Design a protein around this ligand. Structure first.
Ligand code: HEC
Length: 104
């Protein structure tokens, strides 16, 4: 899975909002380094809402997908703003990069 297709997309979708690299400090949203293999609200440096912090679920390729399709519903009353994604492929590459972005 091409990460690029997920990088650019992650930009036009997640630009100067999220973070992956260590240098990417918490800004608008929480950083994603240990995404794969880490539950939600696992940021002791940035406490989230009571809706997301309650979203006790792992961020996998099976979940990320759904959420990517409709994260709003996935977490109502959240702070994250998004419309969603139609193409399932654009989401794959997105998770194909975020994985290599977080893992790193
Ligand atoms: C800033 C305006 C954001 C944009 C753009 C995106 N995200 Fe985000 N995200 C943001 C916040 C403040 C939070 C916390 C809860 C909330 O929804 O407000 C999140 C959370 C996530 C999570 C959950 C991680 C956790 O620790 O629970 C994921 C998996 C996530 N966001 C992914 C993500 C992607 C891939 C985006 C673009 C496609 C994206 N976010 C946009 C704030 C913002």
């Amino acid at each position: 899975g091409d990460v690029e297709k997920g990088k650019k997309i992650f930009i036009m979708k997640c630009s100067q909002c999220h973070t992956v690299e260590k240098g990417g400090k918490h800004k608008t949203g929480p950083n994603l380094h240990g995404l794969f293999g880490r539950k939600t609200g696992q940021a002791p440096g940035y406490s989230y809402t009571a809706a997301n912090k309650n979203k006790g679920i792992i961020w996998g390729e099976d979940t990320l997908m759904e959420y990517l399709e409709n994260p709003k519903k996935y977490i109502p009353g959240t702070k994250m703003i998004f419309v969603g994604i139609k193409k399932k492929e654009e989401r794959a590459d997105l998770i194909a990069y975020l994985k290599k972005a977080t893992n790193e």
